[PDB]
Structure formats: C-alpha cells, structure tokens
From a paper:
Bacillus subtilis can form structurally complex biofilms on solid or liquid surfaces, which requires expression of genes for matrix production. These results, together with further biochemical and in vivo characterization of B. subtilis RemA, suggests that the protein can wrap DNA around its ring-like structure through a LytTR-related domain.
Previously, Winkelmann et al. reported another loss-of-function missense mutation of B. subtilis remA, named sor4, in which arginine 18 was changed into tryptophan (i.e., R18W32). In our structure of (Gt)RemA, arginine 18 localizes at the inner surface of (RemA)8. The guanidium moiety of arginine 18 of one RemA subunit forms a salt bridge and a hydrogen bond with the carboxyl moiety of aspartate 59 and the backbone carbonyl of alanine 17, respectively, both being from the adjacent RemA subunit. An important consequence of the formation of (RemA-R18W)7 is that the arginines 50 and 51, which are crucial for DNA-interaction in the wildtype protein (see above), show a different spacing and orientation in the 7-mer.
Author numbering:
A (entry chain B), G (entry chain E): 2 to 78
B (entry chain A), D (entry chain G): 3 to 77
C (entry chain D): 4 to 77
E (entry chain F): 3 to 78
F (entry chain C): 4 to 78
The structure:
Amino acid sequence: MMKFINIGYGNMVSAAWIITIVSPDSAPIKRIIQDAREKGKLVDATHGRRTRAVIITDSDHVILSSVQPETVANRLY
Amino acid sequence: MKFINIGYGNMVSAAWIITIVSPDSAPIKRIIQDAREKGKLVDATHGRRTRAVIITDSDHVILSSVQPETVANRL
Amino acid sequence: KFINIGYGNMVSAAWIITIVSPDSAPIKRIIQDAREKGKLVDATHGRRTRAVIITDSDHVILSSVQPETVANRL
Amino acid sequence: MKFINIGYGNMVSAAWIITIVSPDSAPIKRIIQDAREKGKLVDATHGRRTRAVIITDSDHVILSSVQPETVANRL
Amino acid sequence: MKFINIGYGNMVSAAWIITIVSPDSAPIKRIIQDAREKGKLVDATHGRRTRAVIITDSDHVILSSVQPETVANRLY
Amino acid sequence: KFINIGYGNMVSAAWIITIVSPDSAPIKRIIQDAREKGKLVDATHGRRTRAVIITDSDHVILSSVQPETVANRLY
Amino acid sequence: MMKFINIGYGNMVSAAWIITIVSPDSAPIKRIIQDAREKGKLVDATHGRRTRAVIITDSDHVILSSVQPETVANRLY
C-alpha cells in the first residue's frame, strides 16, 4: 500500500482523499466535470489521451485520469 | 477493504461513507433529486436499476446497482 | 465500522456525533431544519422514529431502533 | 470508550467533542442561546440541573446534568 | 491524554486544538474581542487571570488560567 | 509527515490531495485562481515550477521539484 | 514524536493541523499574511521579533513565528 498513486504521466493523487473513481459513461458525470471546469476545480491529467477514470476528492476537485478505475484502486496495492 | 467495488468497476472509498440506504422510499428520491441540483449526484448503476444509495461526507449522493448488504460486506 | 440501523440501512460509526431520543430534544426542529437544508435521511421505513443520528456534515438520520442498542452494535 | 451516555440514553461520540465546560459563564450562555436559536442544541438535562456543556464539531451544543470531570471519566 | 484539564474541570480535546498562545500581545486580544462578539468565545478561567488562549479547529477561542507550555505538558 | 519542497519550505503530506505537472494546461487557471484569490504559495524561490501541490484548504503551492520527488520524499 | 510544537516564546502549534511552513521571502505570502491580518485569522507569535516562518493551518489560520522553518519542522520529535 502506497499513500500516493500514479494516475498517469507522473501526476499523483493521495488515496486518503479520494471519494470515488467512476467511468465517464454517464450524463450526470459529464455535468460533474463541467461543474468542476466552471469552478476551476478540474484537474486534467490525461496529458492528451482519452479520459478513462474520473476521480472525485473531498475538496470537491475532479481529477481526470487516463487509466482504468479498477487500475487506479489497484495501484493502491 | 479501503476501496469498494459498487458495480461495473466504479469504486468508492469506505473511509468517506456516511450511510447506505434503500431507494424504496419517497424521502430518499427527494434526496436524489436534491443531489442533481447541487451537482452532487454520481450515477454508477451503469443504466441498471438503483438498489443502494451511498451518501458521502462531501455531500455526494452515489447510486449503486448493488444491494446495501452487498456493499456493506464488500468492505 | 458499519452499523445496521434497521431494514438494511447502514451508518458508519466514525461519523456519528450524537444519537438522541425523540423525547429528549426539540427534535421536530432539528429534523425540519435537516429537510430544509436537504440533509434528512429517513431509514424508519414507515415505523416510528426512536433514534435520531446526527453525523458530521450535518446529516440527520431517522432510525426505528432504540438509541443505546445502536451504540451496543459497535 | 468511543460513545458516551450523557443522560437518558443520549449518546455522544468522544472523537467529535471539542470541549466540556462548566456553566455559569456569560459567553457560553450565548453559545447555548445561539445554538438553541440555530437548531443545533441537544438538551439532555431533564430540568434538575445543568452541570456540563458539551460543544462538538459543527457547533452542536449538548447540555448534561453531571459534572465535566464525570463526563470525561466515562472514557 | 485525549482530553486535557485546562483549569477547574474544564476539558479540551487535544485533537481539536490548533494553537495555544500567550494573551500578552495586541493581535491576540483582537482575536478574543472578535470571538466575544460572534459568540465563539469560551471563558474557562472561572474568573482567574487569563494566561493562555486556545484556538480550536471550529474557530472557538478558549481562555484558560494556565500557562501555554503547561497546557502542552498535560498532554503526556 | 513534513516534506521539504525546496529552499526550506515544508508541506505536511497529510493535506496534499494531488501533485500535478505544470504541463497540464487547465492548472494554469488553477494557479491564477489561487494567485488572484490570495491562496497561492510560491516556493519556487525564483526557480522554475516543476510541481503544483494542491491541498485540502484549497491552497496551491508551487514547488521547484518533480511531482515524483514530492511524493517520494514522504519516506 | 510529539503533537505540540513550540514555535517560540511559549507559543505552541499542533502539528496535525499544519498545512505548510514557508519563508517570509515570497511576496505572495505577504498578501497571505496581510489578508489574514485585516481578516482576523492572524496569530502573531513573534513576540516583537522578525518573522522567520509562516505557519498555515487548516481553518485558514496564519501563524507567524520567529524561528526558522526547518526549526519548526524538526522540533516535531
């Protein structure tokens, strides 16, 4: 088990503060992203690639990753 | 143990769950629409029927296609 | 960690601030203040309210189960 | 030691108590009055006294009929 | 311990204290009047001389008759 | 607990949410949001920004070391 | 390891609540300091001396200390 998790391309997220990791497959989650981008709380760490996991933290930040949600929690190890 | 699979690969951190309840009551459908309004509704049912509603500490309301007991024992 | 408060509904113990009897407060005011801010959680499933669970983040959760028996389930 | 019975079956979680104080101070009587006004008051003193004022996080205020040192002793 | 006696039976949980400072300076007495107005002041001196100001996570300020480096000593 | 992010400045690892590369374009709004709002802490101390540390109090801290350097210095 | 850190002239700070400890060099912190001074979440534990470290806590308190930042951090233990 690691405190910080690689979410791709060197960007790190603390596991202690993750609320949820979800797929971008729905409409309510696209609104979560747009609401985040509007409030300046969106953190885009796909570095260009297709977004595959959406990380929501306590501080109401939304973090976009290029890896799969099962993979993210796995990288906790 | 820390991250819980609530259906279709969607993960939730057990450290932040306040409560898990049944969808089968009118007050709790109001909680769901109250969550869409403040932009705090996360739908993880992947299109299926809602069977557990997860309320986190950040006031997020998360919708799961899995029974509450199943979520509880997946800790 | 998780405590069954009746009818399958779970509350995480780590976030409960207080558990209070409906005879022992201006409960109707605490409850109606909770619905007003949209933080009322009804897990009585039609039965009578017998324990009121205040959590951090100001959620208020109605349970049909006796207060101290909820505590004993720790 | 986690949960405490402070009066008539009313429970408080020790991890969320900020301070247990004695009554008979002017500022705390405004804290009690402010919380009673603001809805965050929990009265466990069925009359007969008030000997401890319990302040938790999220400014919930709780009145108990036994001395603060006793309230702490129940840990 | 978990809870600290700060004078005359009044307790503070160590986990919620942010800072304990001397009363002897101008900036702190504005903190106190600020809290006294907004009703987040807790007076636990039982009338005696104010020698430490405790600032907790809920923005409460708690006045104690005991000295700051004594209050920290009662932790362990 | 306490990590040196360069030139004497410390950050407590328990309050970091994310550590991001200054490459990602949307963060530059994140930095200007903090700098304008007075929540920005610049510890690059003249040098070039190599990691952006975001904390729970919505503080944004600029550091001159790699995000991998910040996370690794935990140990 | 200890919970309370002596930051000068008897003033204590709980380590659990510290977010960051920084040098007074940066002109962005003077705005942070000066924001907190008028706003009334500033604590001045310098006892009149020159400011050597700025402690930023959870709940947005800004605590000014007269010792160096490495000094506050190493005095944890």
